[PDB]
Amino acid sequence: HMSLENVAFNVVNKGHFDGQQGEVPVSIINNTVYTKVDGVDVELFENKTTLPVNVAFELWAKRNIKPVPEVKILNNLGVDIAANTVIWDYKRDAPAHISTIGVCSMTDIAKKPTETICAPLTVFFDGRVDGQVDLFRNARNGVLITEGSVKGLQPSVGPKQASLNGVTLIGEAVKTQFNYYKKVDGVVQQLPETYFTQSRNLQEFKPRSQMEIDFLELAMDEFIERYKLEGYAFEHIVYGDFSHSQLGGLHLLIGLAKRFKESPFELEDFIPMDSTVKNYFITDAQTGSSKCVCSVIDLLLDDFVEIIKSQDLSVVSKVVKVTIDYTEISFMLWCKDGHVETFYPKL
Amino acid sequence: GHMSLENVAFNVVNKGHFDGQQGEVPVSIINNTVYTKVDGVDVELFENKTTLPVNVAFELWAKRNIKPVPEVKILNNLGVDIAANTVIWDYKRDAPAHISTIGVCSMTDIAKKPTETICAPLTVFFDGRVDGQVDLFRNARNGVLITEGSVKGLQPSVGPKQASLNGVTLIGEAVKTQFNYYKKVDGVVQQLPETYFTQSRNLQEFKPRSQMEIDFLELAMDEFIERYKLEGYAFEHIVYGDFSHSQLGGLHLLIGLAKRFKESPFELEDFIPMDSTVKNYFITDAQTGSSKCVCSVIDLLLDDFVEIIKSQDLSVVSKVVKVTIDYTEISFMLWCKDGHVETFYPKLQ
Amino acid sequence: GHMSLENVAFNVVNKGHFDGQQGEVPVSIINNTVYTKVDGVDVELFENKTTLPVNVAFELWAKRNIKPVPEVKILNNLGVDIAANTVIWDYKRDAPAHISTIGVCSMTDIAKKPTETICAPLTVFFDGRVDGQVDLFRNARNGVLITEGSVKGLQPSVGPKQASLNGVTLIGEAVKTQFNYYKKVDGVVQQLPETYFTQSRNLQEFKPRSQMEIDFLELAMDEFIERYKLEGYAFEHIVYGDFSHSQLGGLHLLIGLAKRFKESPFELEDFIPMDSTVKNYFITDAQTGSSKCVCSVIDLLLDDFVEIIKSQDLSVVSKVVKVTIDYTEISFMLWCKDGHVETFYPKLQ
Amino acid sequence: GHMSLENVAFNVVNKGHFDGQQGEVPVSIINNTVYTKVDGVDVELFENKTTLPVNVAFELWAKRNIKPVPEVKILNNLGVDIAANTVIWDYKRDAPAHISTIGVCSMTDIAKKPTETICAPLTVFFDGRVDGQVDLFRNARNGVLITEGSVKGLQPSVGPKQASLNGVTLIGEAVKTQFNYYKKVDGVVQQLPETYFTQSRNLQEFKPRSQMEIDFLELAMDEFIERYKLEGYAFEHIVYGDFSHSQLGGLHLLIGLAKRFKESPFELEDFIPMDSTVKNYFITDAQTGSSKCVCSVIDLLLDDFVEIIKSQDLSVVSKVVKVTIDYTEISFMLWCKDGHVETFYPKLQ
Amino acid sequence: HMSLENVAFNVVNKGHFDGQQGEVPVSIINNTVYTKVDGVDVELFENKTTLPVNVAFELWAKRNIKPVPEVKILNNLGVDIAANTVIWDYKRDAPAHISTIGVCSMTDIAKKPTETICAPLTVFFDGRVDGQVDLFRNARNGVLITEGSVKGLQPSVGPKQASLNGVTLIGEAVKTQFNYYKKVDGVVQQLPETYFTQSRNLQEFKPRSQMEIDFLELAMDEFIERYKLEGYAFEHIVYGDFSHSQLGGLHLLIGLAKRFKESPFELEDFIPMDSTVKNYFITDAQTGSSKCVCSVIDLLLDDFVEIIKSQDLSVVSKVVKVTIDYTEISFMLWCKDGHVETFYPKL
């Protein structure tokens, strides 16, 4: 009893698919799903995916409405597919994964994750659901999240924030802090010690330390003196250089915020997807200094200080690696006669 | 009572039409086309050519009437607005005959039963072969009924010998395709008039139905005219046609086209593709290059055309002649000269 | 290694398919259609009927296999999931036989070589005519192989005489279309069973391949039955067909349709358009008006149908008879009465 | 001067094309299709296959030239860029021959009259049958003219016997389809060369136009060659064709295809669907299975092919032979061996 | 080596077409271009033009990323086509010109602007690029911009502002002030003395003189007295009249701004394109006074005073012409018994 009209009925009553019986009339016209509420057609869903309109409509309706790891985390961890649920990517307005397991006839490749076709794929098990922890144990390749300890297994503490229906938040009414585990070809693997990005937005930026509360509030020369940040080129890397045609540095999201409140600018996101590191096409509207590819990361300023202060400045050029969001990121460090010249994510 | 897209498809894949059987199969909508997955591969089931949503039309098509039914031109002539508890599929247009329904499909329905108030001013088509439809006609304000026999209390009007069975026009033997017709208007039953019927035939597969037609096709021009004493009626112009000048002369009878088509083929464009008593074509003869943009063509049994043309007054020079055909008046234009006929064609709409 | 849309088009415009030649031409994508500009004017190259992106399908079509290849029904029967370093184009559906590829197209590929791990659980089709594919079969877990001759160490199973060459089904003379077949499952080679093959013929251009068929077409009903002593087997019902009632009786053999089609044409709707051993049609006879919604039709050589029907037990009243055809078991339903056969048809899926 | 979508439709529904009559009818645009409402029901009028907006193309189609006009290949060969106060509809592509217009349609027009400055560098097609167009040619920088007779002061070049009348290629009797041609370049009138013309015929309805062709079709191979003393010229290879190997040998003359098509049918794919002097097809013979991806085919009167082949020098082993056909040079490739001809085909573009 | 996949590759790496070699896989589905970044389809471009999806996609990618004259300026000057570049119209999301020269096979009408087909067309040459100045000299019809003097030619100073990737700005890091030149049928032409519009937006309006800083900050009666603006009907023309159903006047963009900060309203731009003079369908949400066609111009208030104070008020009705953005604009002046009644752009 899985039909288009049944999906719609649920959506119109429960706001998502909740397995309730009933039907309502539906009109499919050019990538849009309508229904008839009191004699008039009403838009329910507009397909932006690369899937058929009615397939996507179903998948959207069956999405996971609980806190779940951000898609960038899942990708970094190399997740190919999810197990008995749908992770909706709100940045792209589409599924995170194009194939499913026990969700939708059209997209499914298997009913249960124990089937043989799943072996070479990295499956995401949600430990909050009953008997999923067991399934991980039996699987060849996989990833697990839990809210507490699982006996026999060494945990790796995940990031404080997570996604709840497209909103990134640090919960109090709900737990958004997960333990992570991973397996590869049968063997459990020790995940590395890592930094996490803070997943913040330019229009609603918030500080999370004293050092950041300072950065925003104080002058340039005033900030650098206190924290003894001479020679590290925070003027170039963080604040940015708007004097020439080519925009200099500006690789930290906190630097953009500070600039945005004083003088607004244009940002084009020419690869719209969730990454640890984002490239933007920026054009400053006060001066007219622009840059086509501006690699931007959002670390807590405290962490950026820690990273930059632990490097040796003797050499002229060096590829510096740093584990962030469970992946190695390569920076490029140029120095000159003791001091730092520039330090950015290598493209 | 659970009606879904997947259920319609299931029926279609198993019974070849909607037969009210339970079950489901997976379905993909892309553009104006409906697919289903039969052993791992997507298979085209339906391509929407209507002006309705793809999934609405798909349902309506599936629920079509698969029995003999009057040809759409007959229904239109009789002024039918809507059908009662069924779908009449127009195969010439690849779409429903009527955009609204009664007790068939949620999206298109205006009413459950034809006794509802919204139906009163509409001319409803009742099928008397289905149980208790005859009663419904009796209670209706405006309507049309067909039956296979007598209905006590009512005067019948014998319909045409042919009908449609899944888009095929045929005179049945396994099945009865000859109907009695009845009509009501504002509560009063109406006497339908005495009428001629068109023969609903095609150019590629034309068949004669009388001795006179078997002759026409088989014999020469001068040989046909002498026998049946058809001098002065201008069959050379009206039927055989005149391909000597740039403008194609006459050729208004479908039997005339057939005869020409066997000897030398030509191009016909049907620039208004619909079912009607009189058809206009854009014709271009490929032997000579004589053409005509609007060529009004009717298909009457040749015997009937003789009857019509021989019952007219030839003294006057021009008059508008009316003739009841397929239950509607058709206006012809008759020119004569010094006793004989000059030309006789359907007057352009 | 530089694969682009414009490069595909260039090849298509010059070689008629993708032949790995370098060069480019300008291309316009509008709706589901690919145009190119040949001397100032846009020219249609391809119209997408698949469920894939227009430019993905366009590429895949261009890279299709232009040699004789097994008919898709054979591949499906044998449970083939994917092809190895080529594209098998399904001309009945106007789309690929398989949605995923190996070493053909970036968008659809799941793997470069069939030895990759993701391929293990899938049944791969290797073409033995290409170099070193025979070896790859030997190393594979699940697979199917075709050859033109012997492979040392392996027991062959002779395939059917006909095959597909760019959508045309033919028994070759310039080229060999008869293949040896081999199959493996979970590492173990498997003995394919003794089987009948369908003849893959069309209604408009039917050809006989035995004396018995040359007779069937040419002779009368009572004249055919007496000679071959075919009384009691109900060839009148099963093959010739019964058009006396509303429901069309029998007519389950493609040779029976042909014979009827020459004498009086009819309508056939193929409401599940795909390649399969058994086809269901929605048929409407245009002479009588006898119809049937689901008419299961198979095309066996008449000689084989006699063989099958004559080897059954007639004492019982009803049983499910199985027969291996195109490498798959097909279930028929056999009713008998007081010695003779009543009816014998493919049991509806 | 009031030009609207509804007005175009009105004309189309009444006159079958745009005839400048006033009036309107209601219109529905859905996808790439134009509907109108004739007695309560929507009716398809036009399906857009061009690269232009649906309503722009709809107008342009309606305003097409319905008289005999040169075939598009002739116009292209002569290097015509644009037409003057009319629309030449290309029926092979289902679209205009030229994307821009002069004094026809607001959206596509670049100029009102051909004397405007923007037209100077473009080669304009003037129709001399329309009043005062002959004068316009005289004043133009670059152009082409057709007439039915003499224009005083100018040297004529006799065109081909056939032309297009609403997509039908024919040699007229009701109408004159033989034109005189003239051409100008940068102000100077130019002498067109002596040329052969292709016969523009189809495979399904091929007709002979000489005694030599009537013979070719009717007689055996060895019987035809002996009479006309055609030994050593390799008509076995070039015309009849060689179906013994996998690669199809020769078959470059359209009369050769016809002869083969009557005896055993085959598949032809026209992978570049356009009007041109030389056509490339993807052919697959269904009797043997001999195929060829790119088969260059021309349709000359057999008499002319004999003339061309008999006027060449046979001493050398290989040379590029040029021949003026449809007002353009076509390059053939001639191989010979020890006196006789080996092969002779159009050199691949 | 110009292909769809190559265009995409550049876009994914350089943020625009920069002539770098390489390829990435691409999916075309309904007026949208996707690419596959780490196993998932990502929207790159959505076609809003009247051109084929893949043609427009290429043209967009090859756009000019330097300061260029605003499209209204180009149109006023009668420019038909650009020379070896693409001017992207950000207001319409489409090319300014439908044909090109030496940019894209599908749209090109010629390789070089010296070809004969170009003669009757008004070509835009960019003097900053090498040897374009020469090409202007040889051309029949054209327009040139430079940053300095060209020997032999009389300059006409252009407006202070210009477009940089859709942002209108007065530059400091970059020069947005151009000299203009024009030719017609071989003869060089003297461009007239003109006013320029200020190209400002309602949500981010900024004053550029003392007189404007006053207007915004002060009361109505307070502003009129100081600058001696009695009898000129600034109450009607600038501030606006919201007392009746029909909205009275309000033809200056500075008047809208002042109203918008106090009480917001609806503006429908029923002809969305760049013009010197804009028509809006306005509905004031405080009173309900509306108007279907409200002709609005943005002049520096100082210039509007200058224009209005130089007219003779004796007559009752007069068509007043004023050269703005290199074009004549017709105003309608009604007077009564000495004073002005109304003064608006004539429709």
Side-chain angles (χ1 to χ4, degrees), chain E residues 5-304:
Chain E
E5 280 82 338
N6 189 243
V7 170
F9 171 89
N10 281 250
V11 171
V12 170
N13 285 245
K14 304 302 168 197
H16 78 286
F17 184 86
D18 192 36
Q20 315 289 324
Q21 300 196 24
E23 283 96 14
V24 297
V26 173
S27 255
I28 309 282
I29 186 80
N30 284 141
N31 265 338
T32 305
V33 179
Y34 292 86
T35 188
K36 208 162 281 290
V37 182
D38 311 352
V40 273
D41 296 308
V42 178
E43 188 183 326
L44 290 177
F45 181 75
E46 175 184 294
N47 182 39
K48 296 278 204 198
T49 93
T50 52
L51 302 168
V53 59
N54 64 300
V55 171
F57 174 62
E58 186 169 346
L59 278 175
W60 172 69
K62 297 184 171 173
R63 69 193 175 284
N64 189 313
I65 55 166
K66 310 214 264 81
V68 291
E70 293 187 290
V71 172
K72 64 182 175 186
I73 296 288
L74 294 171
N75 291 3
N76 287 10
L77 290 175
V79 176
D80 291 77
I81 199 168
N84 303 153
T85 183
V86 173
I87 303 298
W88 193 260
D89 188 340
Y90 283 93
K91 292 177 168 55
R92 282 161 55 251
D93 283 338
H97 317 105
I98 194 155
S99 280
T100 51
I101 301 161
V103 179
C104 171
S105 79
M106 279 301 177
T107 57
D108 277 28
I109 61 168
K111 263 274 177 285
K112 290 155 198 203
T114 46
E115 296 195 36
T116 318
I117 188 53
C118 296
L121 306 169
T122 299
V123 183
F124 172 71
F125 304 100
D126 181 16
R128 293 175 291 175
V129 184
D130 307 16
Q132 291 272 294
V133 172
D134 294 66
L135 282 160
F136 178 65
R137 289 194 186 277
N138 299 332
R140 201 159 169 74
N141 296 286
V143 170
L144 183 69
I145 58 167
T146 66
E147 296 168 304
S149 41
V150 171
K151 73 192 193 309
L153 296 171
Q154 313 295 297
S156 169
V157 174
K160 292 180 286 203
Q161 76 275 21
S163 177
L164 188 57
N165 305 124
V167 186
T168 292
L169 55 77
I170 299 167
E172 33 229 53
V174 290
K175 197 179 221 191
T176 55
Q177 253 254 38
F178 303 97
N179 286 338
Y180 281 84
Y181 317 86
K182 181 174 181 166
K183 267 172 75 178
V184 175
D185 287 338
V187 172
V188 166
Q189 298 228 303
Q190 176 98 247
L191 306 182
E193 310 283 290
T194 183
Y195 293 96
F196 298 122
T197 51
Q198 299 295 308
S199 297
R200 294 179 277 199
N201 286 123
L202 192 57
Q203 283 197 324
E204 306 182 290
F205 191 83
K206 294 206 165 283
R208 302 183 181 167
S209 81
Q210 191 64 248
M211 195 194 294
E212 290 190 339
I213 292 167
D214 284 12
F215 181 88
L216 298 172
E217 174 53 25
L218 283 57
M220 185 173 59
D221 310 24
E222 281 203 348
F223 179 77
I224 294 171
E225 281 295 336
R226 190 186 290 193
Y227 294 89
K228 293 91 173 63
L229 292 164
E230 293 86 22
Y232 291 99
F234 268 55
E235 311 102 351
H236 182 85
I237 298 159
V238 188
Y239 290 107
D241 183 13
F242 300 87
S243 58
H244 304 102
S245 301
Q246 187 101 310
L247 196 163
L250 198 62
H251 296 292
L252 252 295
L253 183 52
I254 195 174
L256 280 71
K258 198 215 171 62
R259 178 70 192 187
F260 195 78
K261 255 62 216 86
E262 306 186 279
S263 148
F265 48 99
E266 187 68 50
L267 274 168
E268 164 191 302
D269 184 6
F270 58 94
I271 309 175
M273 77 186 301
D274 210 8
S275 287
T276 306
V277 183
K278 288 290 289 175
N279 297 131
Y280 300 114
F281 195 137
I282 167 166
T283 309
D284 182 61
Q286 169 48 18
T287 61
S289 171
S290 47
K291 195 198 294 183
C292 310
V293 201
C294 194
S295 51
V296 184
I297 197 175
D298 182 31
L299 288 177
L300 187 75
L301 195 50
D302 301 53
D303 294 6
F304 185 72

Side-chain angles (χ1 to χ4, degrees), chain C residues 11-17 28 30-31 35 38-45 47 61 64 66 68 165-175 205 207, chain D residues 32 49-52 76 93 96-99 243-246 265 267 269 271-274 280 282-291 293-294 348-349:
Chain C
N11 281 249
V12 173
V13 172
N14 285 47
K15 302 301 200 164
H17 78 286
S28 255
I30 305 171
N31 291 140
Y35 292 86
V38 181
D39 292 65
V41 272
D42 296 54
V43 178
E44 189 193 24
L45 290 176
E47 178 177 5
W61 172 69
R64 70 193 175 284
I66 56 164
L165 189 57
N166 305 124
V168 187
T169 293
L170 54 76
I171 297 170
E173 302 173 36
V175 289
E205 303 181 285
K207 266 209 178 80
Chain D
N32 259 323
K49 299 276 212 186
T50 92
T51 51
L52 302 173
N76 292 2
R93 281 161 56 252
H98 317 103
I99 281 307
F243 303 85
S244 57
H245 303 102
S246 170
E267 188 69 51
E269 183 181 43
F271 58 90
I272 306 176
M274 81 184 313
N280 296 134
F282 195 136
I283 166 166
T284 309
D285 183 60
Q287 170 77 155
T288 61
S290 171
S291 46
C293 311
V294 200
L348 301 173
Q349 287 179 327

Side-chain angles (χ1 to χ4, degrees), chain C residues 70-77 88-91 93 97 275:
Chain C
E71 295 190 290
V72 172
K73 63 181 176 188
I74 297 287
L75 294 171
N76 292 2
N77 286 11
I88 304 297
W89 193 261
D90 189 338
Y91 283 93
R93 281 161 56 252
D275 207 14

Side-chain angles (χ1 to χ4, degrees), chain D residues 158-172:
Chain D
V158 177
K161 295 178 182 194
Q162 76 276 21
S164 177
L165 189 57
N166 305 124
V168 187
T169 293
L170 54 76
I171 297 170

